[PDB]
């Protein structure tokens, strides 16, 4: 009576038992949609109140094997009371262990879900300031904002290094449940290898981050000597031939006495032209250098934009001072020339 009451309990427990088995192994066989944060989360929940189920059911199980002992302690029924004893036993420890797995097995997801989100942002933020800075710096107040600006990115990229330190904890902790998961019950991690690949993702694009500002900032040291280079010889030789042009134009415009020393001024000045010859070569070879470092920081900036995805030309400028510069020179000597010979014939 209470023999046979007890079998026909325990059978239907282990059903439930195993019920609550195929409803996980279901589960934990879906990798996640769309929306992986709230599906895991969702999930969570599930496999919490799954759990509680199967342990209520762990306690139904006690009972029936308390009562079971005090049956078989009095009969040609037990044999078959004890093996169901111990196949009930036996199925409810390992949905015990499946449940309480598959629970961990999510929570390390969950870590690693939200980890990758968090770091995408960051990423977005860094790699936006990167995008944003199209200008090239024109002077050398503009030069050191610009310098100022990577610095602070460039800080704010070290500090989040823990950030994705701990993704690589996360990653390697979700890794190592899984494979528990896989070595115990049999079933193949279907969720990792999503996250692997989106961790390693995130991992180059911050790597690009690091490098290209450490490119971008060394790429305005080597302009910035190049700006200083070029302003030094130009300035110089810009204010020279304002000078030399209006002390020509005096001279030239301005008896026999006379005329002696109109060629004298006209004959000397012609000399003193012919002496800055090498310093505008000088200004020419120091100012094409600028022009190609204003090249190279340019186009270093639209590649790496390209590779996530003008307003003027910032070398255009310059090219515009060179031209200014060698026209007013080029007309300088002719017209001190041409004059020295209408003296001449004279």
């Given at each position: 009576?209470?023999?046979q009451?007890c079998?026909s309990?325990l059978?239907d427990?282990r059903?439930?038992?195993?019920?609550?088995?195929t409803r996980?192994?279901?589960?934990l066989?879906?990798p996640?949609?769309k929306?992986?944060?709230?599906?895991?989360?969702?999930r969570?929940?599930?496999?919490?109140k799954?759990?509680?189920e199967?342990?209520?059911?762990?306690?139904?199980?006690?009972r029936?094997?308390?009562e079971?002992?005090?049956?078989?302690?009095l009969?040609?029924?037990?044999?078959?009371?004890r093996?169901?004893?111990?196949?009930?036993?036996?199925k409810?420890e390992?949905?015990?262990s499946?449940?309480?797995?598959?629970?961990?097995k999510?929570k390390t997801?969950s870590?690693?879900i939200?980890?990758?989100?968090?770091?995408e942002?960051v990423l977005?933020?860094?790699?936006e300031?990167?995008?944003?800075?199209?200008?090239?710096?024109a002077t050398?107040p503009?030069?050191?904002a610009?310098?100022?600006?990577?610095k602070?990115?460039r800080?704010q990229?070290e500090?989040?290094?823990?950030?994705?330190?701990?993704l690589?904890?996360?990653?390697r902790?979700?890794?190592?449940?899984?494979?528990?998961?896989?070595?115990?019950?049999?079933?193949?991690?279907v969720?990792?290898?999503?996250?692997?690949?989106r961790?390693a993702?995130?991992?180059?694009?911050?790597?690009?981050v690091?490098?290209?500002?450490?490119?971008?900032?060394?790429?305005?040291?080597?302009?910035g000597?190049?700006?200083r280079?070029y302003?030094?010889?130009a300035?110089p030789?810009?204010?020279?031939?304002?000078?030399?042009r209006?002390?020509?134009?005096?001279?030239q415009?301005?008896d026999?006495?006379?005329?002696?020393?109109?060629?004298?001024?006209?004959?000397?000045?012609?000399e003193?032209?012919?002496?800055?010859?090498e310093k505008v070569?000088?200004?020419?070879?120091?100012?094409?250098?600028?022009?190609?470092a204003?090249?190279?920081?340019?186009?270093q900036?639209?590649?790496?934009?390209?590779?996530?995805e003008?307003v003027?030309?910032?070398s255009?400028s310059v090219i515009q001072?060179?031209?200014?510069l060698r026209?007013?020179?080029?007309?300088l000597?002719?017209?001190?020339s041409?004059?020295?010979?209408?003296i001449?014939?004279?």
């Amino acid at each position: 009576s209470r023999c046979q009451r007890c079998i026909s309990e325990l059978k239907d427990i282990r059903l439930q038992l195993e019920a609550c088995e195929t409803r996980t192994v279901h589960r934990l066989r879906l990798p996640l949609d769309k929306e992986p944060a709230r599906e895991c989360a969702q999930r969570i929940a599930e496999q919490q109140k799954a759990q509680a189920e199967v342990e209520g059911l762990g306690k139904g199980v006690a009972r029936l094997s308390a009562e079971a002992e005090k049956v078989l302690a009095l009969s040609p029924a037990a044999p078959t009371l004890r093996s169901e004893l111990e196949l009930t036993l036996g199925k409810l420890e390992q949905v015990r262990s499946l449940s309480a797995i598959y629970l961990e097995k999510l929570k390390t997801i969950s870590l690693v879900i939200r980890g990758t989100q968090g770091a995408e942002e960051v990423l977005r933020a860094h790699e936006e300031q990167l995008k944003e800075a199209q200008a090239v710096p024109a002077t050398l107040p503009e030069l050191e904002a610009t310098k100022a600006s990577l610095k602070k990115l460039r800080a704010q990229a070290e500090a989040q290094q823990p950030t994705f330190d701990a993704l690589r904890d996360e990653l390697r902790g979700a890794q190592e449940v899984g494979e528990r998961l896989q070595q115990r019950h049999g079933e193949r991690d279907v969720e990792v290898e999503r996250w692997r690949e989106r961790v390693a993702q995130l991992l180059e694009r911050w790597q690009a981050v690091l490098a290209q500002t450490d490119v971008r900032q060394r790429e305005l040291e080597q302009l910035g000597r190049q700006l200083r280079y070029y302003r030094e010889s130009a300035d110089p030789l810009g204010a020279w031939l304002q000078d030399a042009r209006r002390r020509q134009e005096q001279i030239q415009a301005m008896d026999s006495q006379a005329v002696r020393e109109q060629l004298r001024q006209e004959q000397a000045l012609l000399e003193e032209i012919e002496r800055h010859g090498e310093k505008v070569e000088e200004c020419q070879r120091f100012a094409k250098q600028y022009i190609n470092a204003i090249k190279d920081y340019e186009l270093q900036l639209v590649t790496y934009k390209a590779q996530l995805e003008k307003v003027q030309s910032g070398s255009e400028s310059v090219i515009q001072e060179y031209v200014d510069l060698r026209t007013h020179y080029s007309e300088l000597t002719t017209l001190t020339s041409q004059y020295i010979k209408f003296i001449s014939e004279t």
